């Protein structure tokens, strides 16, 4: 695997679409 944080590095690293302003997934948990 690739060592990195909590995350497992997938194409969702974009912090997820959090309750508010849901742009930082915005691809389908990818």
Known sequence: MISSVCVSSY?????GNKPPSKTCLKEEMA
Not at 11 to 15: A, D, L, Q, V, Y
Request: no cysteine.
């Open 11 to 15: 194409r969702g690293r974009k912090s």
